Design a protein around this ligand. Structure first.
Ligand SMILES: OC[C@@H]1O[C@@H](OC[C@@H]2O[C@@H](OC[C@@H]3O[C@@H](O)[C@H](O)[C@H]3O)[C@H](O)[C@H]2O)[C@H](O)[C@H]1O
Ligand SMILES: [Ca+2]
Length: 206
């Protein structure tokens, strides 16, 4: 049972639209998820045109993008800088119940982070470079969670929080409620219902 695709934010057309047509387009935020006045440029990315994030800007995605107990997220990033706790994909029912794919987390490594009630540490023990393209993916199947870097599985575990089942949660690229906005390039955002097979993974990564 391969994971089913639901959303593809590719930026290929120099806009924040979902190419599958399922979801409304993304918005532009200021330096947090809940504010406005940012900027988004478009530069050559991993596939076609990628989104540029200047370190004070983000993208609001539509509420309820993920709303199940079985889901996955894939994307490419090219960091111009790294800042601790700063999100890529995020992630939140409210400020106390959130998920976050973090390039440099509290242990200084890439991690899938959830908090704060409770706290989940999805530690990869792997560190991301600036000025290079890294592929990141992760799947959630009823508490069963796995994290992939460049196609390589680095974290697995269980008892992941069901943050999204029953909630109209806020989703964003590059910003949250507390930390520096991501700076650099984000490309090819894809959302899935169901947990990506290893095969789909290695495909997406290469
Ligand atoms: O709630 C949003 C996040 O809170 C802020 O916390 C500051 C840093 O987060 C903590 O990370 C360590 C966590 O606490 C441990 O119990 C658990 O193992 C870890 O997940 C550190 O205390 C602070 O450096 C962040 O700014 C924001 O992302
Ligand atoms: Ca693209």
């Amino acid at each position: 049972e391969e994971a089913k695709l639901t959303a593809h934010y590719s930026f290929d057309n120099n806009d924040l639209s979902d190419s599958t047509g399922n979801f409304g387009p993304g918005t532009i935020t200021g330096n947090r998820i809940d504010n406005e006045g940012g900027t988004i440029a478009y530069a050559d990315g991993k596939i076609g045109k990628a989104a540029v994030l200047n370190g004070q800007s983000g993208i609001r995605l539509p509420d309820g993008l993920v709303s199940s107990n079985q889901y996955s997220v894939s994307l490419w990033v090219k960091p111009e800088q790294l800042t601790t706790h700063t999100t890529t994909f995020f992630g939140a029912k409210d400020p106390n119940h959130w998920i976050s794919l973090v390039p440099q987390g509290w242990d200084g490594n890439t991690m899938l982070w959830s908090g704060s009630s409770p706290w989940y540490d999805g530690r990869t023990f792997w560190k991301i470079p600036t000025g290079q393209w890294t592929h990141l993916a992760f799947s959630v199947d009823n508490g069963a969670v796995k994290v992939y870097i460049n196609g390589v599985e680095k974290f697995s575990g269980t008892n992941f929080p069901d943050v999204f089942t029953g909630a109209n949660a806020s989703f964003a690229l590059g910003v949250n409620w507390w930390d520096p906005p991501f700076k650099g390039l984000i490309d090819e955002l894809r959302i899935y219902e169901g947990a990506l097979t290893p095969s789909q993974v290695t495909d997406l990564a290469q």
